[PDB]
């Protein structure tokens, strides 16, 4: 079906350029507009502009007249956004969204690319088992998880047992401490009966620092 899959998280110094991509599939690419939407943390969506891939032509909204460009690679069905001379105001999530021109609305959206602009250097997390306390012998549900500690910038991606354990999982919003760095926890609930059955690995990816980590959580 229609899929828009955008490139990963970016961390860039102020003044540098960024180029974000968005690969489309499952339809004639040249036949539909490509729109870009900005989303600052906890703020509303903003329509930046679109590129008409059939004419190669770009329109920008007032705020994004200036340091912003759209590019295409029709052969490879990818659209790009490039921001340059980056400011802190650009730290945000950027979305491409197919422009269904027959009713002047975007219909399919990419998953979002998160860009942090900072003078500071990527710092990768440490991961610690939050180890379950309920003895497998007794009943009820037992709780367990991973403490993903001391990283910059946002986001990190937590899954469990390589994304094949999703039920009962809570990954908390990241929070800051005085260190200037982020921490969070991902916890899961599981029948205490199964802690002595099968294993629990949490899989933490933090892409701006290129750390992929697996942690075996156990008694």
């Amino acid at each position: 079906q229609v899929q828009l899959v955008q490139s990963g998280p970016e961390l860039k110094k102020p003044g540098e350029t960024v180029k974000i991509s968005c690969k489309a599939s499952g339809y004639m690419f040249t036949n539909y507009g490509m729109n870009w939407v900005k989303q600052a943390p906890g703020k509303a969506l903003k329509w930046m502009g679109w590129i008409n891939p059939y004419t190669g032509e770009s329109t920008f909204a007032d705020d994004f007249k200036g340091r912003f460009a759209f590019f295409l690679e029709t052969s490879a069905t990818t659209a790009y956004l490039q921001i340059n001379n980056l400011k802190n105001e650009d730290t945000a999530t950027y979305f491409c969204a197919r422009g269904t021109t027959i009713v002047w609305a975007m219909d399919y959206w990419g998953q979002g690319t998160s860009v942090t602009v900072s003078s500071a250097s990527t710092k990768g997390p440490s991961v610690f088992p939050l180890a379950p306390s309920s003895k497998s012998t007794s009943g009820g549900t037992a709780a367990l998880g991973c403490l993903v500690k001391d990283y910059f910038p946002e986001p990190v991606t937590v899954s469990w047992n390589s994304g094949a354990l999703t039920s009962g999982v809570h990954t908390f919003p990241a929070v800051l401490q005085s260190s200037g760095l982020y921490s969070l926890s991902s916890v899961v609930t599981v029948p205490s009966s199964s802690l002595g059955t099968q294993t629990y690995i949490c899989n933490v990816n933090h892409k701006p620092s290129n750390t992929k980590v697996d942690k075996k959580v156990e008694p």
């Binding site: 969506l45 329509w47 329109t59 002047w104 609305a105 219909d107 399919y108 979002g112 908390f172």
Partner: protein, 218 residues
């Protein structure tokens, strides 16, 4: 330059009840060609937006029947009748009649439900973490409502201050509860100066405060 206003910013509704987000506009959204190009998206926590309604009153494919939109000129309503747990999210109106297209500021739909008491857990710091030179203690409150919860730390039965952090999840998409983590962070040395670590939870669902604790080195 048109303005696109949404009301409210925050709309609590209970399950099965109806919800009206409204969206005004500084100028008519009728095109000189006859159409109204007003649309709605829903953005669920973490996820990218979903197409709901196009041209004022049309469900996009797959969008359930209990969503409907209406209005004309400057005033539009989105009505979710018989509200459900997964309608939780932020709703935006989007106009593309006049250049340049704009979004409303969004309405956060919140589900109202009966009180539910937390499941409380506690995790001592890991050996691994200690080896590196700090202790973090974590206290988990699982599956509760309302958001409000007082979490207190007793270290050897002395109350703590401004050395822990709270994080709360967004409302759950199936049962509409919250989950919370409180994390006390001490230096390895500080941690070893003491023996009993406890988080005491106070909450509307609990008839009296529940305490979870451990003694060091278990």
């Amino acid at each position: 330059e048109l303005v696109m206003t949404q009301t409210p910013l925050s709309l609590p509704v209970s399950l099965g009840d109806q919800a009206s987000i409204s969206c005004r506009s500084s100028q008519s959204l009728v095109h000189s060609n006859g159409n109204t190009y007003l649309h709605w998206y829903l953005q669920k926590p973490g996820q990218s937006p979903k197409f709901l309604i196009y041209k004022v009153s049309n469900r996009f494919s797959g969008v359930p029947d209990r969503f409907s939109g209406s209005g004309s000129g400057t005033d539009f309503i989105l009505k979710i009748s018989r509200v459900e747990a997964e309608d939780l999210g932020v709703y935006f109106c989007f106009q593309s009649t006049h250049f340049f297209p704009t979004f409303g500021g969004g309405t956060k739909l919140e589900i109202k439900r009966t009180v539910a008491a937390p499941s409380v857990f506690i995790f001592p710091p890991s050996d691994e973490q200690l080896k590196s030179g700090t202790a973090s203690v974590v206290c988990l409150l699982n599956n509760f409502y309302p958001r409000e919860a007082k979490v207190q730390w007793k270290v050897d039965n002395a109350l703590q201050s401004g050395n822990s952090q709270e994080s709360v999840t967004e409302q759950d998409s199936k049962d509409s509860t919250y989950s919370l983590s409180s994390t006390l962070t001490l230096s390895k040395a500080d941690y070893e100066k003491h023996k009993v670590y406890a988080c005491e939870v106070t909450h509307q669902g609990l008839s009296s405060p529940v305490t979870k604790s451990f003694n060091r080195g278990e």
